[PDB]
UniProtKB/Swiss-Prot annotation:
It is found in: Cell membrane; Nucleus; Cytoplasm; Cytoplasm, Cell cortex. The lineage of its organism: Eukaryota, Metazoa, Chordata, Craniata, Vertebrata. Interacts with CDC42; the interaction is demonstrated with IQGAP1 in GTP-bound and in nucleotide-free state. Interacts with RAC1. Does not interact with RHOA. Interacts with TSG101. Interacts with PAK6. Interacts with TMEM14B; this interaction increases IQGAP1 phosphorylation and induces its nuclear translocation. Interacts with SASH1. Interacts with PJVK. Interacts with SLC26A4; this interaction enhances the chloride-bicarbonate exchange activity of SLC26A4. Interacts with SVEP1. Interacts with ILK; the interaction is required for localization of IQGAP to the cell cortex. Expressed in the placenta, lung, and kidney. A lower level expression is seen in the heart, liver, skeletal muscle and pancreas. This is Ras GTPase-activating-like protein IQGAP1. It comes from Homo sapiens. Plays a crucial role in regulating the dynamics and assembly of the actin cytoskeleton. Recruited to the cell cortex by interaction with ILK which allows it to cooperate with its effector DIAPH1 to locally stabilize microtubules and allow stable insertion of caveolae into the plasma membrane. Binds to activated CDC42 but does not stimulate its GTPase activity. Associates with calmodulin. May promote neurite outgrowth. May play a possible role in cell cycle regulation by contributing to cell cycle progression after DNA replication arrest. The gene is IQGAP1.
Amino acid sequence: GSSGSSGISLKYTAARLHEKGVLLEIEDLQVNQFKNVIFEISPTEEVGDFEVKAKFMGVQMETFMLHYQDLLQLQYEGVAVMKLFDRAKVNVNLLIFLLNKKFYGKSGPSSG
């Protein structure tokens, strides 16, 4: 319960997210190029906020954040496609689905 290596940022390739359906396309590279693209999603201590980083150059100055409410706001409006970094595109309908099982999974008391 205590002695357990927890944390670490999830590492997935662009092709992986594309194959599943999450990642739509990228306004810069091609489908076959996805193989040379990896996304590093760092988790958070709280529930709702997430760290979305794209391994390419190595920006250790800041990281793109992604709230949970924002993802839902798009579902209510209609925006199915999400413009990331004004280039990469991900499906909001599937993006939330994956995280719902990936990160979404605490191990504490609920009481409600």
